Design a protein around this ligand. Structure first.
Ligand SMILES: COc1ccc2nc(C)c(O[C@@H]3C[C@H]4C(=O)N[C@]5(C(=O)NS(=O)(=O)C6(C)CC6)C[C@H]5/C=C\CCCCC[C@H](NC(=O)O[C@H](C)C(F)(F)F)C(=O)N4C3)nc2c1
Ligand SMILES: [Zn+2]
Length: 198
């Protein structure tokens, strides 16, 4: 009935991947109860820092990455959802199901990565566990893991960045290619396809 129709909650920032030092590590900034409440209200007054956020809905958790001033993630995680902010829910500024891509204005206090113009194929995937995984670029939207590992280790890291040697953003991780459960390659949205979208 129309009176009872519910609304999906917002995506919520629940942590970050700290890349500021010589050691990468995940930090949690909100626990599951606060996450649920913030998703319903859409009001998040927690201070945001850093480039790679850990984000959650009521049912899924993944990453989101700031590049020029946009917080980017995957459509298969966020759908068309708002993100929680200090002033309430914020509507997506980019949505592209064909790329598995969404974006919101980057939160106040975030730091943005710079889009790579190096043309390098020696990349680094950052996961939600703060693993920094070498990936050889193999095409516009694909790269191979130098050390394959079970897909379990990549689950929950969609929306994370592929970085070049200089720390610029080359892409947003979106899918893993596996054989017998071992991830041998990854697919990503290339930064140019974001720069086009922008
Ligand atoms: C609804 O509208 C949509 C529009 C476009 C769209 N486009 C893509 C490509 C898509 O793909 C889905 C979701 C991702 C995924 O699981 N994302 C990671 C992740 O971590 N998600 S997540 O954070 O856990 C989560 C679910 C919370 C958000 C990064 C994966 C980690 C481990 C793999 C686990 C087994 C899965 C292996 C899959 N392989 C694969 O499809 O490969 C083929 C050959 C491709 F062509 F894509 F390469 C895979 O990776 N998929 C399967 N769904 C959609 C949906
Ligand atoms: Zn670069």
């Amino acid at each position: 009935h129309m009176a009872s129709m519910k609304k999906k909650g917002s995506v919520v920032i629940v942590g970050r991947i700290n890349l500021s030092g010589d050691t990468a590590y995940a930090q949690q900034t909100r626990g599951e109860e606060g996450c649920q409440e913030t998703s319903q209200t859409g009001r998040d007054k927690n201070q945001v820092e850093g480039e790679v956020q850990i984000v959650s809905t009521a049912t899924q958790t993944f990453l989101a990455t700031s590049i020029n001033g946009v917080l980017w993630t995957v459509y298969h995680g966020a759908g068309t959802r708002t993100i929680a902010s200090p002033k309430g829910p914020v509507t997506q500024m980019y949505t592209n199901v064909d790329k598995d891509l969404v974006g919101w204005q980057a939160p106040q206090g975030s730091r943005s990565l710079t889009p790579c113009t190096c043309g390098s194929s020696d990349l680094y995937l950052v996961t939600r566990h703060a693993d920094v995984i070498p990936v050889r670029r193999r095409g516009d939207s694909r790269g191979s893991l130098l050390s394959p590992r079970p897909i379990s280790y990549l689950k929950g890291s969609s929306g994370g960045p592929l970085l070049c040697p200089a720390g610029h953003a080359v892409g947003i991780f979106r899918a893993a290619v596996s054989t017998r459960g071992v991830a041998k390659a990854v697919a990503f949205i290339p930064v140019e396809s974001l720069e086009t979208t922008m």
